[PDB]
Amino acid sequence: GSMTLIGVPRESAEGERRVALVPKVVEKLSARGLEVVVESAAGAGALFSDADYERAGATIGDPWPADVVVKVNPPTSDEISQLKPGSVLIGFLAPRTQPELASRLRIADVTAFAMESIPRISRAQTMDALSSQANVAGYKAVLLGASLSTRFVPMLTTAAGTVKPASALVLGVGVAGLQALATAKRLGAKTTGYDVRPEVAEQVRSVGAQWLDLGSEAERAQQQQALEDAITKFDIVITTALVPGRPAPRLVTAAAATGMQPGSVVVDLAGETGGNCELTEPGRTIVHHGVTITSPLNLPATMPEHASELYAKNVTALLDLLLTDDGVAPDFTDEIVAASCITRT
C-alpha cells in the first residue's frame, strides 16, 4: 500500500458536516500500509480535529492530487480542476441529476465511481451508501417530528393528567421509512406504515407497525381519497418516497395536511425533488392551518459522526475491490466496478 495515496477533502457544500473517512477508518487504512492525506478541518463538521487524523496515521495536506480521492458530495468544477489525470474519484456523483459530471471527469482522465450506482446485489451489501445515509435520515426524521410536535410522543400517566400516545404514519417504507417506524415505536408512538409495494408489508410488521391497507379509474380515486382520509388521523406523518431522477411522488395533498389536528407535524424528506407534500417549502418549516410542515434537506449532516463512519465503511468496501498489491487496479469484469463507474465508455 505504501505507493498509494488516498485523499480526503473537506466538504464545501453549504450545511454539509459529513467527511468521507473518519479517523477510526483512516487508522485501518494506515495499518494496511496505505498513505492517507486529509485536508485541514475536513472533520470539523463532525467535531474531529486534525490531530485525530494524524493520530490515525494521516498527514494533513492537499487531498486533491491523490491517487484515489474519496469524498461525500459531487465535486464542483473548481474541485475537478484539481484532480490529477489517472486518478480515481469515489463519492456521491449524482449520475441522474448531473450527467455532465461524468463527461467532465472523463475529460479530466479521472476514473470515477458513483456511490449511488453501486448495484443492489449481495456482494455489494457493505457498500450501500444510499442505505446507510437513509438509515440516519429516517432516525433523525422522527426526532425532528417529535421535537416540532406540540404533544408528547409516549403515553404518559402523570399526577397532572394522562395523555394518549402519538400516532405516527410513514409513507414510503424503504430504508429511511423503516428506520422512522422503528424509531417512532421506540419513542412510544402507535405506528403505521404504507408503501405502494405490497412485499414491504412484512418489513413494516417486523418493526411493530400496522400495515395500512386502503381497500382501475374510479377505484384509483377512492384509494387516493382513502389515503387522504387516513393521513388526517395521525399526529406525525413522515414521507420518504423518491423516484431517482424524477419529481417526488405526491402523497400528502393540501386537503390531507389541512385535515390533520392542530399541532400535528408532516416531516417531508423529499424536498430536494419537490416534496411528497403539496404544501412543502423545501428546507423550511412552516405552519398551515395549525399543522407544521417541515422539509429537511440534509438529515445525514445533522448526525455527522455516525453518518460519516457508516459512509466511510461503504466507500472503503468499494475501494478494497479496486486495490491490489500493485496499487489501484479496477477489474471491470467485476459487476460492481463496471456498474458504479460513470466514466467508462
Next chain:
Amino acid sequence: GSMTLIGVPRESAEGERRVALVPKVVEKLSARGLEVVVESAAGAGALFSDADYERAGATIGDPWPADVVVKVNPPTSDEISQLKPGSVLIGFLAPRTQPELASRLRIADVTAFAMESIPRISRAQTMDALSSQANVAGYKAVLLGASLSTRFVPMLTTAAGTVKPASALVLGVGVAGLQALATAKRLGAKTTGYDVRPEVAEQVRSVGAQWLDLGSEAERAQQQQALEDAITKFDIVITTALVPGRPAPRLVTAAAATGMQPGSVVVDLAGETGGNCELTEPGRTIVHHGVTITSPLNLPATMPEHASELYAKNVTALLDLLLTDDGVAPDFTDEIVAASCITRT
C-alpha cells in the same frame, strides 16, 4: 357559576408559547356554568384558534378585568395595572425571585396565588405545576440531546456497520431528571442517574437506570473528582439540579466537559440560574473542545399543547378549591390556599 368570569390572557414573554387554559379544559369550565373570556390569539403559540375557544364556550375579549385571571408567567407592571380590585390571580408568580410582585398585587387589591408555592402535600398532587412542566422539560431535554449528538442513541446493527448505544447520565433526579432517564432509555440509551439525595436511588432504578455511587474534607474532593471522571465517560449528560432562589449547583466542571469525547452533548437545564455547567452560555448552544454545551431556557414552551393542558389541569384543580356555589371564596384555613397565597398579610 354564571356570575363568575375566568380570564385567560395571551402570554407576552419572549419565546413563550404556552397558554394557561386549553380549549378542552375551557369546555369543562363552561359546562359547569362559569363564563370564560380568552384574549384573541392566546392559544396561537400552541396552534389553537380563537374558534377553538369559542367552540369550548368561551368568548374572545379582554381577559384582564375578570374575577379570576389565570396565566402562565408572572404579570408585567402594565398587566398588573389592568387587574380589577377584588379579583384573584393564579399563575407562576416567582415568589422567591420577584418578591416585589406580591407587594404590587396587594396594593392593587388582588388576591394572588403562586403555583410555585403549592405545598408538596397529598391533597395538592393534582395541582403541582412545577412537576407537570418539569416532566415536559425532562422529555424535551433528551430529544434536544439526541438531536445535537453526532451519533445515534440506539444500538444499531446495519449492513454498513454496527454502532454501540449512547450512554446517558442525568445529574439531579427530580421530576425532570426522572423523565429524562425514562425518555433516554426509550430511545435506546444505556442510562445512569445521580442525585445528592440517597432516597432517589429507588426512583432511578425504577426507570431502568444505573444508580451512580461515587465511593469529610479530602473525601469531598475525591468525590468531586470521581464525579468529574464519571462525566467524561458519557455521550449525553443532562443536568437538572436547582436551588429555589439561589444559583444553580455546579455539577459539571470545565475539565469534566472537556474530558468528554468529541460529539458528546451536555444539556444544562439550569441556565436561568447560572447553569450546572461551568461552560454553559444561557439560552445558547456552543461547542467547547468538540463537546456541545446547550442551555435551553424554556423547554415547556417547545411542546406547548401538552405543557399547557397539564398546566391548565393544575390551575383548575386549585381554582376548584377557591370556588363555591357563591362564586370566588378562598378558605384560608385550607393549607393549600394559605400556603400558595402571596398577598395575605
